[PDB]
Amino acid sequence: SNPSLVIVSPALPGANNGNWRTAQRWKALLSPVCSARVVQQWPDADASADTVMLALHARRSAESIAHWAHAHPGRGLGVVLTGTDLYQDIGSDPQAQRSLQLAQRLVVLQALGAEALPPECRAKARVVYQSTSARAELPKSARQLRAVMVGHLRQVKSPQTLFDAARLLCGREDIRIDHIGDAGDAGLGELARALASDCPGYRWLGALPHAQTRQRIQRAHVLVHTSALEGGAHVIMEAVRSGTPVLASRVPGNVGMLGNDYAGYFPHGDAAALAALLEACRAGQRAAGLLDSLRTQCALRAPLFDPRAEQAALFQLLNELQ
Ligand SMILES: CC(=O)N[C@H]1[C@@H](OP(=O)(O)OP(=O)(O)OC[C@H]2O[C@@H](n3ccc(=O)[nH]c3=O)[C@H](O)[C@@H]2O)O[C@H](CO)[C@@H](O)[C@@H]1O
């Protein structure tokens, strides 16, 4: 019969974040060829019928990955490198390192991912670009530039780069920055609140439901993403597949999503560089404007994030694991 797949996600069930989104999307995409379930840890009371595991995060799921590898030595294990593992933990973390060794297949979420893996792990590495539904590209007003950034506030999102750019632009009534995401890591929420009180063109909206967040991404002239690292960020896909161009920090996770030739990168942590891009976007608002050049480049990336493509890549992965 068809495989019994268990997806391990460290997200809380129903959480509005990437780790929950991937796991629930992979379950939907794989459902026509297998019996699929999502858990936070393995084993559980239903563990005896599972034949394949896809485990997100080499460190956060290392305990379930180890359980699987001990119960199924050399068979049925895929480890998904969701970001903070690939670009932080696998360097020094012995649990992350063991997960890498035990996996039958490693999944990276964009083309550059395997460059961060040990060379001995590259033969068993598999690229699975993520997917999102498209939204109609909307005509937008030339009267103002409205940027949006989306990420639950934590240090890896480097939200200070956005706060520092919003400060450089404090006086520009013709440039608006909306920031969507909960106040997680200590004091980042306080920084956003203080900035919003000083610089009215900057608004921190807190966490928003995914529906409303996709509507905000679709309506913004540009999405800004400042991260220190990303596995391959859902928010960048969401923008691209809405016809909303991106300004992103030049880090491998972002480069993997937007392309080596993309004209909308700033150096990581360079607030002045990001504020200069926002000024260019605004100056451009006929054709030849930076926003138009970036929408052209993003439109060439949009077919990467087709759910039919992700599904075909997952079908191949599952065939390799059973
Ligand atoms: C730092 C890092 O490596 N991040 C990874 C993390 O996702 P992480 O959760 O950090 O970030 P993503 O951008 O990929 O996912 C956030 C998701 O939550 C939604 N959202 C967020 C905040 C908010 O207030 N409202 C809202 O709806 C966004 O629209 C998006 O769908 O795991 C994902 C895979 O599992 C990877 O794709 C990401 O690269």
Side-chain angles (χ1 to χ4, degrees), residues 109-146:
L109 302 173
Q110 39 71 24
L112 300 182
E115 303 190 351
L117 292 167
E120 70 274 9
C121 300
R122 301 196 184 151
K124 76 180 176 184
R126 301 294 183 265
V127 177
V128 177
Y129 274 102
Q130 304 190 89
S131 74
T132 194
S133 62
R135 293 295 183 283
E137 176 183 343
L138 307 183
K140 289 158 189 174
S141 175
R143 293 222 215 235
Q144 197 166 233
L145 187 72
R146 296 196 59 113

mmCIF file of all heavy atoms in Angstrom, residues 109-146:
data_model
loop_
_atom_site.group_PDB
_atom_site.id
_atom_site.type_symbol
_atom_site.label_atom_id
_atom_site.label_comp_id
_atom_site.label_asym_id
_atom_site.label_seq_id
_atom_site.Cartn_x
_atom_site.Cartn_y
_atom_site.Cartn_z
ATOM 1 N N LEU A 109 15.773 24.443 1.113
ATOM 2 C CA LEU A 109 14.552 25.081 0.561
ATOM 3 C C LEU A 109 14.860 26.121 -0.541
ATOM 4 O O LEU A 109 13.895 26.830 -1.006
ATOM 5 C CB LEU A 109 13.814 25.749 1.715
ATOM 6 C CG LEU A 109 13.412 24.821 2.873
ATOM 7 C CD1 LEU A 109 12.843 25.589 4.030
ATOM 8 C CD2 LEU A 109 12.409 23.767 2.447
ATOM 9 N N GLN A 110 16.106 26.190 -0.977
ATOM 10 C CA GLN A 110 16.509 26.945 -2.192
ATOM 11 C C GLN A 110 17.870 26.465 -2.638
ATOM 12 O O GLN A 110 18.435 25.631 -1.946
ATOM 13 C CB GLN A 110 16.489 28.457 -1.996
ATOM 14 C CG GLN A 110 16.979 28.950 -0.654
ATOM 15 C CD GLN A 110 18.457 28.838 -0.368
ATOM 16 O OE1 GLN A 110 19.280 28.785 -1.259
ATOM 17 N NE2 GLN A 110 18.772 28.660 0.901
ATOM 18 N N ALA A 111 18.233 26.910 -3.844
ATOM 19 C CA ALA A 111 19.279 26.329 -4.721
ATOM 20 C C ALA A 111 20.638 26.390 -4.040
ATOM 21 O O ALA A 111 21.476 25.489 -4.322
ATOM 22 C CB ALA A 111 19.295 27.103 -6.021
ATOM 23 N N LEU A 112 20.876 27.411 -3.204
ATOM 24 C CA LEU A 112 22.171 27.648 -2.529
ATOM 25 C C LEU A 112 22.334 26.840 -1.239
ATOM 26 O O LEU A 112 23.469 26.791 -0.753
ATOM 27 C CB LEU A 112 22.324 29.131 -2.230
ATOM 28 C CG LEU A 112 22.288 30.034 -3.462
ATOM 29 C CD1 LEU A 112 22.494 31.472 -3.044
ATOM 30 C CD2 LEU A 112 23.328 29.616 -4.522
ATOM 31 N N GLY A 113 21.285 26.180 -0.764
ATOM 32 C CA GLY A 113 21.318 25.542 0.565
ATOM 33 C C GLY A 113 22.495 24.594 0.750
ATOM 34 O O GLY A 113 23.153 24.650 1.823
ATOM 35 N N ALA A 114 22.803 23.729 -0.237
ATOM 36 C CA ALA A 114 23.792 22.643 -0.050
ATOM 37 C C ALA A 114 25.215 23.208 0.089
ATOM 38 O O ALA A 114 26.147 22.411 0.520
ATOM 39 C CB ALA A 114 23.718 21.650 -1.187
ATOM 40 N N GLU A 115 25.439 24.456 -0.356
ATOM 41 C CA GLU A 115 26.747 25.166 -0.203
ATOM 42 C C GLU A 115 27.076 25.304 1.297
ATOM 43 O O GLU A 115 28.280 25.391 1.655
ATOM 44 C CB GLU A 115 26.770 26.539 -0.897
ATOM 45 C CG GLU A 115 26.456 26.526 -2.391
ATOM 46 C CD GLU A 115 26.713 27.840 -3.113
ATOM 47 O OE1 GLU A 115 26.983 28.848 -2.450
ATOM 48 O OE2 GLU A 115 26.626 27.866 -4.346
ATOM 49 N N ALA A 116 26.070 25.387 2.165
ATOM 50 C CA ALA A 116 26.251 25.542 3.631
ATOM 51 C C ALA A 116 26.456 24.174 4.299
ATOM 52 O O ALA A 116 26.777 24.145 5.492
ATOM 53 C CB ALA A 116 25.056 26.254 4.235
ATOM 54 N N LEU A 117 26.159 23.063 3.607
ATOM 55 C CA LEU A 117 26.322 21.699 4.190
ATOM 56 C C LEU A 117 27.780 21.246 4.078
ATOM 57 O O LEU A 117 28.517 21.639 3.180
ATOM 58 C CB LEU A 117 25.433 20.676 3.482
ATOM 59 C CG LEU A 117 23.929 20.826 3.681
ATOM 60 C CD1 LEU A 117 23.146 19.978 2.708
ATOM 61 C CD2 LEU A 117 23.520 20.428 5.074
ATOM 62 N N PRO A 118 28.220 20.365 4.984
ATOM 63 C CA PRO A 118 29.462 19.634 4.773
ATOM 64 C C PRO A 118 29.454 18.920 3.425
ATOM 65 O O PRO A 118 28.435 18.327 3.052
ATOM 66 C CB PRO A 118 29.437 18.604 5.898
ATOM 67 C CG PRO A 118 28.612 19.270 6.949
ATOM 68 C CD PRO A 118 27.487 19.927 6.184
ATOM 69 N N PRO A 119 30.606 18.903 2.713
ATOM 70 C CA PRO A 119 30.687 18.249 1.408
ATOM 71 C C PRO A 119 30.247 16.781 1.460
ATOM 72 O O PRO A 119 29.639 16.309 0.528
ATOM 73 C CB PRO A 119 32.145 18.463 0.959
ATOM 74 C CG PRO A 119 32.893 18.925 2.197
ATOM 75 C CD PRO A 119 31.868 19.560 3.106
ATOM 76 N N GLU A 120 30.449 16.089 2.580
ATOM 77 C CA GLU A 120 30.065 14.658 2.671
ATOM 78 C C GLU A 120 28.538 14.536 2.697
ATOM 79 O O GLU A 120 28.035 13.449 2.418
ATOM 80 C CB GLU A 120 30.772 13.953 3.835
ATOM 81 C CG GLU A 120 30.286 14.386 5.199
ATOM 82 C CD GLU A 120 30.958 15.612 5.768
ATOM 83 O OE1 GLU A 120 31.719 16.281 5.022
ATOM 84 O OE2 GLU A 120 30.722 15.878 6.965
ATOM 85 N N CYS A 121 27.796 15.620 2.959
ATOM 86 C CA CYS A 121 26.313 15.591 3.027
ATOM 87 C C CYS A 121 25.697 16.054 1.703
ATOM 88 O O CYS A 121 24.477 16.113 1.679
ATOM 89 C CB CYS A 121 25.774 16.495 4.137
ATOM 90 S SG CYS A 121 26.389 15.995 5.770
ATOM 91 N N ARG A 122 26.481 16.404 0.678
ATOM 92 C CA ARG A 122 25.875 17.049 -0.520
ATOM 93 C C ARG A 122 25.249 16.014 -1.437
ATOM 94 O O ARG A 122 24.193 16.319 -1.994
ATOM 95 C CB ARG A 122 26.869 17.964 -1.203
ATOM 96 C CG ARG A 122 27.354 19.041 -0.245
ATOM 97 C CD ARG A 122 28.019 20.156 -0.988
ATOM 98 N NE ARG A 122 28.538 21.090 -0.007
ATOM 99 C CZ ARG A 122 29.595 21.855 -0.185
ATOM 100 N NH1 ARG A 122 30.291 21.794 -1.311
ATOM 101 N NH2 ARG A 122 30.005 22.646 0.787
ATOM 102 N N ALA A 123 25.808 14.806 -1.549
ATOM 103 C CA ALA A 123 25.236 13.776 -2.447
ATOM 104 C C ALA A 123 23.779 13.457 -2.056
ATOM 105 O O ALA A 123 22.990 13.100 -2.923
ATOM 106 C CB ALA A 123 26.107 12.533 -2.463
ATOM 107 N N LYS A 124 23.409 13.538 -0.781
ATOM 108 C CA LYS A 124 22.074 13.128 -0.319
ATOM 109 C C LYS A 124 21.173 14.359 -0.095
ATOM 110 O O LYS A 124 20.038 14.177 0.352
ATOM 111 C CB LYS A 124 22.237 12.239 0.917
ATOM 112 C CG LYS A 124 22.580 12.959 2.214
ATOM 113 C CD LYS A 124 22.734 11.997 3.422
ATOM 114 C CE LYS A 124 23.174 12.696 4.694
ATOM 115 N NZ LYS A 124 23.417 11.742 5.828
ATOM 116 N N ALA A 125 21.649 15.539 -0.457
ATOM 117 C CA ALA A 125 20.888 16.799 -0.360
ATOM 118 C C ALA A 125 19.991 16.966 -1.586
ATOM 119 O O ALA A 125 20.420 16.612 -2.753
ATOM 120 C CB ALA A 125 21.845 17.931 -0.217
ATOM 121 N N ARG A 126 18.772 17.431 -1.309
ATOM 122 C CA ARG A 126 17.668 17.601 -2.267
ATOM 123 C C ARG A 126 17.109 19.016 -2.105
ATOM 124 O O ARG A 126 16.863 19.433 -0.982
ATOM 125 C CB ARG A 126 16.594 16.541 -2.067
ATOM 126 C CG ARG A 126 17.113 15.102 -2.236
ATOM 127 C CD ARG A 126 17.538 14.846 -3.693
ATOM 128 N NE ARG A 126 17.973 13.462 -3.861
ATOM 129 C CZ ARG A 126 19.237 13.026 -3.800
ATOM 130 N NH1 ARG A 126 20.196 13.834 -3.483
ATOM 131 N NH2 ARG A 126 19.495 11.734 -3.955
ATOM 132 N N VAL A 127 16.964 19.749 -3.197
ATOM 133 C CA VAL A 127 16.340 21.109 -3.189
ATOM 134 C C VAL A 127 14.828 20.967 -3.374
ATOM 135 O O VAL A 127 14.320 20.337 -4.355
ATOM 136 C CB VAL A 127 16.925 22.070 -4.244
ATOM 137 C CG1 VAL A 127 16.207 23.429 -4.238
ATOM 138 C CG2 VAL A 127 18.414 22.293 -4.051
ATOM 139 N N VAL A 128 14.089 21.571 -2.469
ATOM 140 C CA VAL A 128 12.613 21.714 -2.577
ATOM 141 C C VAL A 128 12.293 23.187 -2.354
ATOM 142 O O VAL A 128 12.137 23.611 -1.205
ATOM 143 C CB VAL A 128 11.894 20.815 -1.567
ATOM 144 C CG1 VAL A 128 10.393 21.012 -1.635
ATOM 145 C CG2 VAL A 128 12.278 19.345 -1.805
ATOM 146 N N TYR A 129 12.283 23.938 -3.415
ATOM 147 C CA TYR A 129 11.619 25.281 -3.403
ATOM 148 C C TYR A 129 10.188 25.137 -2.882
ATOM 149 O O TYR A 129 9.392 24.268 -3.278
ATOM 150 C CB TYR A 129 11.670 25.889 -4.800
ATOM 151 C CG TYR A 129 12.948 26.629 -5.055
ATOM 152 C CD1 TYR A 129 13.948 26.066 -5.804
ATOM 153 C CD2 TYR A 129 13.173 27.897 -4.538
ATOM 154 C CE1 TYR A 129 15.138 26.715 -6.047
ATOM 155 C CE2 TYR A 129 14.362 28.565 -4.769
ATOM 156 C CZ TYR A 129 15.366 27.958 -5.510
ATOM 157 O OH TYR A 129 16.518 28.631 -5.786
ATOM 158 N N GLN A 130 9.838 26.024 -1.959
ATOM 159 C CA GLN A 130 8.490 26.124 -1.397
ATOM 160 C C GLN A 130 7.521 26.804 -2.370
ATOM 161 O O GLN A 130 7.945 27.299 -3.446
ATOM 162 C CB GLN A 130 8.568 26.794 -0.041
ATOM 163 C CG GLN A 130 9.520 26.029 0.885
ATOM 164 C CD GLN A 130 9.429 26.516 2.300
ATOM 165 O OE1 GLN A 130 8.623 26.049 3.117
ATOM 166 N NE2 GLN A 130 10.166 27.576 2.553
ATOM 167 N N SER A 131 6.241 26.769 -2.022
ATOM 168 C CA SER A 131 5.168 27.248 -2.921
ATOM 169 C C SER A 131 4.135 28.052 -2.130
ATOM 170 O O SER A 131 4.013 27.862 -0.942
ATOM 171 C CB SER A 131 4.579 26.110 -3.703
ATOM 172 O OG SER A 131 3.759 25.336 -2.844
ATOM 173 N N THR A 132 3.385 28.874 -2.839
ATOM 174 C CA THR A 132 2.291 29.705 -2.308
ATOM 175 C C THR A 132 1.360 30.026 -3.484
ATOM 176 O O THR A 132 1.814 30.112 -4.666
ATOM 177 C CB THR A 132 2.874 30.930 -1.556
ATOM 178 O OG1 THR A 132 1.852 31.551 -0.785
ATOM 179 C CG2 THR A 132 3.482 31.981 -2.438
ATOM 180 N N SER A 133 0.083 30.204 -3.179
ATOM 181 C CA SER A 133 -0.935 30.601 -4.173
ATOM 182 C C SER A 133 -0.614 32.012 -4.670
ATOM 183 O O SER A 133 -0.020 32.816 -3.897
ATOM 184 C CB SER A 133 -2.313 30.499 -3.559
ATOM 185 O OG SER A 133 -2.439 31.380 -2.444
ATOM 186 N N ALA A 134 -0.906 32.281 -5.923
ATOM 187 C CA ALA A 134 -0.662 33.587 -6.537
ATOM 188 C C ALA A 134 -1.807 34.529 -6.138
ATOM 189 O O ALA A 134 -2.951 34.082 -5.748
ATOM 190 C CB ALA A 134 -0.483 33.464 -8.020
ATOM 191 N N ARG A 135 -1.516 35.814 -6.205
ATOM 192 C CA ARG A 135 -2.500 36.913 -6.054
ATOM 193 C C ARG A 135 -2.326 37.853 -7.258
ATOM 194 O O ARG A 135 -1.198 37.985 -7.753
ATOM 195 C CB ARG A 135 -2.317 37.691 -4.752
ATOM 196 C CG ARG A 135 -2.627 36.933 -3.474
ATOM 197 C CD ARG A 135 -4.080 36.518 -3.308
ATOM 198 N NE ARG A 135 -4.176 35.888 -1.998
ATOM 199 C CZ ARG A 135 -3.774 34.655 -1.723
ATOM 200 N NH1 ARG A 135 -3.339 33.835 -2.673
ATOM 201 N NH2 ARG A 135 -3.860 34.226 -0.491
ATOM 202 N N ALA A 136 -3.430 38.447 -7.748
ATOM 203 C CA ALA A 136 -3.431 39.303 -8.960
ATOM 204 C C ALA A 136 -2.542 40.482 -8.611
ATOM 205 O O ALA A 136 -2.633 40.989 -7.470
ATOM 206 C CB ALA A 136 -4.830 39.770 -9.361
ATOM 207 N N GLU A 137 -1.630 40.837 -9.496
ATOM 208 C CA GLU A 137 -0.827 42.061 -9.304
ATOM 209 C C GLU A 137 -1.776 43.272 -9.461
ATOM 210 O O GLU A 137 -2.391 43.365 -10.503
ATOM 211 C CB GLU A 137 0.276 42.151 -10.337
ATOM 212 C CG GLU A 137 1.022 43.457 -10.199
ATOM 213 C CD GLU A 137 2.111 43.793 -11.176
ATOM 214 O OE1 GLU A 137 2.587 42.895 -11.857
ATOM 215 O OE2 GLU A 137 2.503 44.977 -11.193
ATOM 216 N N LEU A 138 -1.828 44.163 -8.473
ATOM 217 C CA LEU A 138 -2.748 45.332 -8.410
ATOM 218 C C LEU A 138 -2.005 46.540 -8.976
ATOM 219 O O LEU A 138 -0.816 46.682 -8.724
ATOM 220 C CB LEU A 138 -3.146 45.583 -6.947
ATOM 221 C CG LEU A 138 -3.709 44.378 -6.205
ATOM 222 C CD1 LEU A 138 -4.123 44.763 -4.788
ATOM 223 C CD2 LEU A 138 -4.861 43.755 -6.992
ATOM 224 N N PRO A 139 -2.669 47.446 -9.732
ATOM 225 C CA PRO A 139 -2.117 48.768 -9.986
ATOM 226 C C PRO A 139 -2.047 49.494 -8.638
ATOM 227 O O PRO A 139 -2.898 49.278 -7.787
ATOM 228 C CB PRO A 139 -3.100 49.413 -10.972
ATOM 229 C CG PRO A 139 -3.862 48.252 -11.530
ATOM 230 C CD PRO A 139 -3.970 47.258 -10.392
ATOM 231 N N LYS A 140 -1.060 50.379 -8.486
ATOM 232 C CA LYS A 140 -0.811 51.050 -7.191
ATOM 233 C C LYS A 140 -0.637 52.549 -7.450
ATOM 234 O O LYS A 140 -0.318 52.897 -8.594
ATOM 235 C CB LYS A 140 0.327 50.345 -6.459
ATOM 236 C CG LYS A 140 -0.064 48.957 -5.915
ATOM 237 C CD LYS A 140 1.097 48.070 -5.679
ATOM 238 C CE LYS A 140 0.687 46.640 -5.355
ATOM 239 N NZ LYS A 140 1.891 45.794 -5.272
ATOM 240 N N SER A 141 -0.889 53.367 -6.433
ATOM 241 C CA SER A 141 -0.815 54.850 -6.501
ATOM 242 C C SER A 141 0.650 55.285 -6.590
ATOM 243 O O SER A 141 1.521 54.601 -6.014
ATOM 244 C CB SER A 141 -1.500 55.519 -5.327
ATOM 245 O OG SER A 141 -1.315 56.928 -5.377
ATOM 246 N N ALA A 142 0.918 56.375 -7.312
ATOM 247 C CA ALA A 142 2.271 56.985 -7.426
ATOM 248 C C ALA A 142 2.452 58.097 -6.379
ATOM 249 O O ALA A 142 3.548 58.689 -6.350
ATOM 250 C CB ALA A 142 2.502 57.501 -8.815
ATOM 251 N N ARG A 143 1.433 58.387 -5.572
ATOM 252 C CA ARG A 143 1.434 59.523 -4.624
ATOM 253 C C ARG A 143 2.366 59.245 -3.443
ATOM 254 O O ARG A 143 2.813 60.209 -2.828
ATOM 255 C CB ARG A 143 0.026 59.818 -4.103
ATOM 256 C CG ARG A 143 -0.925 60.333 -5.173
ATOM 257 C CD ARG A 143 -1.772 61.477 -4.630
ATOM 258 N NE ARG A 143 -3.127 61.516 -5.154
ATOM 259 C CZ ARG A 143 -3.705 62.556 -5.753
ATOM 260 N NH1 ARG A 143 -3.022 63.674 -5.939
ATOM 261 N NH2 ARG A 143 -4.969 62.476 -6.161
ATOM 262 N N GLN A 144 2.574 57.979 -3.072
ATOM 263 C CA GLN A 144 3.342 57.599 -1.859
ATOM 264 C C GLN A 144 4.003 56.247 -2.135
ATOM 265 O O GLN A 144 3.435 55.443 -2.965
ATOM 266 C CB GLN A 144 2.360 57.496 -0.699
ATOM 267 C CG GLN A 144 2.989 57.523 0.668
ATOM 268 C CD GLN A 144 1.927 57.771 1.708
ATOM 269 O OE1 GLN A 144 2.050 58.680 2.529
ATOM 270 N NE2 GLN A 144 0.881 56.959 1.678
ATOM 271 N N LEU A 145 5.080 55.961 -1.420
ATOM 272 C CA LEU A 145 5.678 54.597 -1.400
ATOM 273 C C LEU A 145 5.322 53.907 -0.087
ATOM 274 O O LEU A 145 5.667 54.428 0.949
ATOM 275 C CB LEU A 145 7.194 54.657 -1.515
ATOM 276 C CG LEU A 145 7.814 53.277 -1.669
ATOM 277 C CD1 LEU A 145 7.540 52.687 -3.027
ATOM 278 C CD2 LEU A 145 9.308 53.311 -1.361
ATOM 279 N N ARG A 146 4.668 52.751 -0.143
ATOM 280 C CA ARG A 146 4.271 52.012 1.068
ATOM 281 C C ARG A 146 5.037 50.691 1.027
ATOM 282 O O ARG A 146 4.830 49.918 0.079
ATOM 283 C CB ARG A 146 2.750 51.844 1.112
ATOM 284 C CG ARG A 146 1.987 53.164 1.229
ATOM 285 C CD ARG A 146 0.518 53.005 1.657
ATOM 286 N NE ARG A 146 0.468 52.335 2.959
ATOM 287 C CZ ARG A 146 0.054 52.850 4.120
ATOM 288 N NH1 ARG A 146 -0.450 54.076 4.203
ATOM 289 N NH2 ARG A 146 0.108 52.093 5.202
#
